[PDB]
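Hi R.,

Here are the chain sequences for the assembly we discussed:
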Amino acid sequence: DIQVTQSPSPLSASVGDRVTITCRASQTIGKYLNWYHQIPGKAPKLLISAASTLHSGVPSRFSGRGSGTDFTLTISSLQPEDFGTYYCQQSYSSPPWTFGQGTKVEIKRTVAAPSVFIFPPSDEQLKSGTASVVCLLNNFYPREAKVQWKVDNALQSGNSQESVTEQDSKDSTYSLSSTLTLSKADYEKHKVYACEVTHQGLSSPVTKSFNR
Amino acid sequence: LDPLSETKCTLKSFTVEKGIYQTSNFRVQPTESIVRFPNITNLCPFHEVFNATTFASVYAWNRKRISNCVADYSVIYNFAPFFAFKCYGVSPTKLNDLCFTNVYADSFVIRGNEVSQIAPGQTGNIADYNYKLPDDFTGCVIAWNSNKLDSKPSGNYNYLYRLFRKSKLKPFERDISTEIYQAGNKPCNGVAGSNCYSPLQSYGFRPTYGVGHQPYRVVVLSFELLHAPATVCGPKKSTNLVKNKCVNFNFNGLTGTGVLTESNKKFLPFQQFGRDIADTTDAVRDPQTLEILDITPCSFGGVSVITPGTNTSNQVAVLYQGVNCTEVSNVFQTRAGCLIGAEYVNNSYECDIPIGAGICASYQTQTSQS
Amino acid sequence: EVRLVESGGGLVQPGGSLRLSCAASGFTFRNYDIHWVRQTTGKGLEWVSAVGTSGDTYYLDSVKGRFTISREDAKKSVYLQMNSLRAGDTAMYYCVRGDASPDNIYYYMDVWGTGTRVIVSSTKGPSVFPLAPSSKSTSGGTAALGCLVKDYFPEPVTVSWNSGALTSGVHTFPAVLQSSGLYSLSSVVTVPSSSLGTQTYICNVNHKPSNTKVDKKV
Amino acid sequence: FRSSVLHSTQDLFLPFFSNVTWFHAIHVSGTNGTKRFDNPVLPFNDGVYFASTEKSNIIRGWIFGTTLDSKTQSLLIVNNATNVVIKVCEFQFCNDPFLDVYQKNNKSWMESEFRVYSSANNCTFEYVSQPFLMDLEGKEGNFKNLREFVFKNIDGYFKIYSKHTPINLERDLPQGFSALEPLVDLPIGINITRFQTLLALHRSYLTPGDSSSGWTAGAAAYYVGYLQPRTFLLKYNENGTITDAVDCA
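And here is the predicted structure of the full complex:
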């Protein structure tokens, strides 16, 4: 079919910059493309129609170009109310109009040391059978660090899921929190739970581990 | 503020005398609008092409310049469940609303795995040498299963396809040659052999073959979009026929306003509309029904306010001249109009305020003052 | 002005059949094409599968058969009836209005809707697990008092850390869907290390679907 | 539509008490006498009064055109029993005034014997009409029908009028008012200046009409009358039809 290779997921930008979101198609769709804007917590909205004409209600310097397969959203000026994910609609693809993957634009700030703190499961939680160890990762701008649960000098991961919160308004930082979900026998037998935090901001990866 | 106030800012005074004063003119406003239009979708070369025995071959795809017709693509949808209804360039939801210049029907039957190969910008072995679409093909490809009409047993060898072309295929190019082609360094003119073979091979259409080898009929409609006068437009729409209501009608192009009713007139089998002594449209035929309608002018009239005098009182009454009290407090129908704001007394006195056609109003004490 | 209400609701189980709606008000209902866009949590727009005025009905090759469209101009609203759904159709559905130029085919879909959420799983009872930060080996002056709410089906849930005196520290972590089918969020507070012993920061849960107010803080 | 009104209009009508060029192009003789077949090439001046009188087939064709040899288009208004064959396609003409032959009325040949077909060329438009313009099978026995076909060419479309009226046995010509209603309004864009007719005999030969009202091979009633722009006052009946008119000029 006709796919679209949009910009990568992490695209840092601040108030005032030249952001270029390129939507390249696999064929020659001419000048059939539409830009959207889906902010977190609200239905998407239309920004550019036919890849060259601004439909309505978009005066924040949203200019578009394209000839053959050359579309790009050159944003000459950014606003704090124009942040979110963008999608490209290939009109010249098929009656089932397939949209893009999504390009989110975050805010640029300084680099802070991620304050880590590992928490063993509750006392009454072990009696029920289950257990959950939490390694909290907060106040980090470079959202590219992963969590490696080092259980007794062994990478016994696979059952640990993590998620990130929304970007803060006056802090612009993220919050990561993984949950080591294991059984009761896997906790009362192991003693090393070094949460290997491989982050770009910090100089040395800190590994906090508790002892029973 | 009141009808009395309306008489005040009209006579340029603050002490209205006793009498009747016409101020405004009541006109019924047309609420709805009818766009009933004759000359609608009719016979077209669209049919007889999707339902036949054999459409064409792979290397011998036919062509039909459909024109001189009101293009109505609604008949295409009400058909058997298709296998591929992809449209490249034209939105499938606006086929009945776009005036196209020319449309060429090109039908051909290929196997199952060849349905996805035929597409603008995709190459292969059947969409590269037999029938290739350009990079600006503004048309729709329609494919469906035909395992009942072109599935003869023992292999229907009637369909052939061209292979091993000397050069690349051009948009809308006919290849009906049958010359013997060789790979190289091999004399082959009219005889075949191991490396030499005819540029055509049969298609195996048998029920034993699984998915991907069944015959599928594919027809591509090339919608040419230009600036010249179009020949195949979309079908014009037409609303319902509402009567006994002043609306906007568009019968046969003569757009007008008024109340549509039913008359006892008998038009000639060739006359459609008609005028009166003053050369004004008074009756027309129904476009899609040939019914004898009767168009009457929208209800209007003058507004007269009966004021007994500001020095006496402030109660007034309005008189809608030429109104049957149907087109918008006591209400009484008179021979001159609809009198709203007064009751008809069965007594008889001297005419104080002349209303019209014998009716007369006055400010008299009931028992109250009205 | 131009709004498309999608108050259809959905709480069926895997193997059932629900019925949604998309009612518009503010423009011509007959002279407009209605779509149905799907937005999955963590993904993009899936498909449209719109309908036309003159009986035009389209489907996707990966969704055909288990869906059917029906346009009803009587009440100026459309409906979406589907057959038995699989475990991959649990997403947020929308309905956009596709429009183009009066004499072109440049579709842009400007008029969107609101969004209907559909989930297919089983309900259970939530459980809160305390997190005591007795180890003061941190950087100093940074406490992470939290209450792990695990094993709960309904997504809408809030952890009120004494609202009014929370000092803007409640971190609402997203609900992570486990392999079993139950979510597990986190709710920590940004308080100094000296706050451990001053007052009792109760993590009062206000789970509305289960109607079970939790207690017994850390 | 007009009912019980007195409307006057200005259009290409036929003047009253005018001289109509009666042509008698008959071929019949009881003693095998030599006779001539009339076929003049009459000029066209935006009007005609073709009012022939036939029973089965006497005059079948209303070919128009100015340089109607190899350069201009045609009309082909042959109205054989099957259907109308109107066609403006470019067609290689022939100076033959007859379609196939005046004699040989046998049904062993084609239904029309299109011998005038010389060579086909590129076309521009075609109009195949199913309702034929000549509706008569000779079921009466001794009464014929009139063939009023007043034509006119306007800057827009081409108008064609026709009406069936009782033309029972009389002295010379029926003295009575007869209105003509339009049937087709096909477009046209040729600068027509002349007109040439053609005669042909149908293959469905009836019984030998030794009487005067029988075999119509020698009962031609070729009528041609040019139109002239004049004001005409029309009176409509209660049914919406025209009862009579006045010349006004």
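Chains A and D do not touch (no CB pair under 8 Å). The longest strand of chain A covers residues 130-140.

Let me know if anything looks off.

Best,
T.
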